[PDB]
Design a protein around this ligand. Structure first.
Ligand SMILES: Cc1cc2c(cc1C)N(C[C@H](O)[C@H](O)[C@H](O)COP(=O)(O)OP(=O)(O)OC[C@H]1O[C@@H](n3cnc4c(N)ncnc43)[C@H](O)[C@@H]1O)c1[nH]c(=O)[nH]c(=O)c1N2
Length: 369
């Protein structure tokens, strides 16, 4: 068949790359994942992920992992609040919808996927820096580690990938929004008023161009994110200096309730990130020297504010893995072309929705109401 006596290199062990590896490996394909992280115990900073019926859940179902996801995920409702702490809307999880998109911790999702792979599928401390096409095989160059070869390379190393040029000359762009994220440990003790306002639900609030998103129970930690249009002055806050970030945020949140200000004051450290997009437009390069493609945020990074992100990437893994293993294609290149053509349609729809949603939500008069 297409991959008999051939091997596949996946670049990046995020949720998308590890899913791609499981879907190929369960079909008897020789596949390795190269992951820059030093070891499997690396904590992944970030909020939870939720898998959707028909995309992320379909990939887990094909892998035999859907029940494992359900068992480690948490169905969560959503509260909409104003800047004064008034709950404007409470949507609790109804038992009939409890399988719709339960929330999973990113380390828990990585553990499910790693435990599903054969020993030594993931090669840790392997930061890909360059590719070179040979006669039949790619040579992979890693930072300060020996080279490897593969018949097929799948780029899955996230939105800021610098190994995309064999596929496309498209560049990542800033969208003009900015995100500050943090975790609070023991939130029932350290931000009790804000914790009680969430009342076991996710919470969202918007006032004068500032958005706040919180999850009060990411494996017992509260995760929150504040998003706004990137200030022109920054076209001036040191994210290593918590006192500088606190000062900036308390000026921005000056007319919000003290339950929100308490969140800012008690946070031990903050992470800042400009919103970026890897825009799908014109098709990627045709006639590449050897078989290569991209999946996940490497293919279609987009703003996350409407819940686009990992589900598009898991759909990529499901489509590409099916094309490589279903025996219908005459070549790996044709299997790749078919996946890319499909991904350009659902990916452009997702990016269009994400970008329109970002425009609407950052108008200075928006409220989730
Ligand atoms: C603030 C915020 C909030 C959200 C989200 C993003 C952001 C920024 N997302 C998006 C979601 O997190 C995203 O789509 C997925 O993490 C993409 O998974 P990937 O595996 O493609 O990349 P991901 O970035 O997760 O993984 C890439 C992997 O490759 C590795 N790597 C990088 N460079 C490498 C190199 N050169 N060599 C080897 N390995 C390398 C990295 O270490 C990492 O393990 C989201 N999505 C969603 O569905 N729901 C949500 O609620 C949110 N929320």
């Amino acid at each position: 068949n297409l991959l008999s006596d051939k091997n596949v290199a996946i670049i990046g062990g995020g949720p998308v790359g590890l899913t791609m590896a499981k879907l190929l490996q369960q079909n008897g394909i020789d596949v390795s994942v190269y992951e820059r992280d030093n070891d499997r115990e690396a904590r992944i900073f970030g909020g939870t992920l939720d898998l959707h019926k028909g995309s992320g859940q379909e990939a887990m179902k094909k892998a035999g992992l859907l029940q494992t996801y359900y068992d480690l995920a948490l169905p969560m409702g959503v509260n909409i609040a104003d800047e004064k702490g008034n709950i404007l809307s409470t949507k609790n999880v109804k038992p009939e919808n409890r399988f719709d998109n339960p929330e999973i911790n990113r380390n828990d999702l990585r553990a499910i996927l790693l435990n599903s792979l054969e020993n030594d599928t993931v090669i840790w401390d392997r930061k890909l820096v360059m590719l070179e096409p040979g006669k039949k095989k790619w040579t992979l160059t890693f930072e300060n580690k020996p080279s490897e070869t593969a018949d097929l390379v799948i780029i899955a190393n996230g939105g800021m990938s610098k190994v995309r040029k064999f596929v496309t000359d498209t560049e990542v762009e800033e969208t003009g929004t900015f995100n500050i994220q943090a975790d609070i440990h023991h939130p029932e003790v350290n931000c009790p008023g804000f914790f009680q306002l969430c009342n076991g639900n996710r919470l969202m609030a918007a006032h004068q161009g500032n958005l706040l998103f919180a999850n009060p129970n990411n494996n017992g930690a509260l995760h929150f994110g504040i998003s706004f249009k990137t200030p022109d002055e920054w076209k001036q806050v040191d994210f290593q200096n918590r006192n500088s970030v606190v000062d900036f945020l308390l000026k921005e949140f000056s007319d919000w309730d003290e339950r929100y200000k308490e969140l800012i004051r008690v946070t031990s450290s903050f992470v800042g990130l400009a919103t970026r997009i890897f825009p799908l437009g014109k098709s990627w390069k045709s006639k590449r020297p050897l078989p290569i493609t991209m999946i996940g945020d490497a293919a279609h990074l987009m703003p996350p504010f409407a819940g686009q992100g990992v589900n598009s990437g898991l759909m990529d893994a499901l489509i590409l893995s099916d094309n490589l293993t279903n025996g219908k294609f005459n070549s790996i290149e044709e299997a790749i072309e078919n996946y890319e053509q499909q991904m350009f349609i659902y990916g452009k729809e997702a990016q269009e929705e994400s970008t329109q949603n970002e425009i609407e939500m950052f108008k200075p008069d928006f409220t989730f109401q």
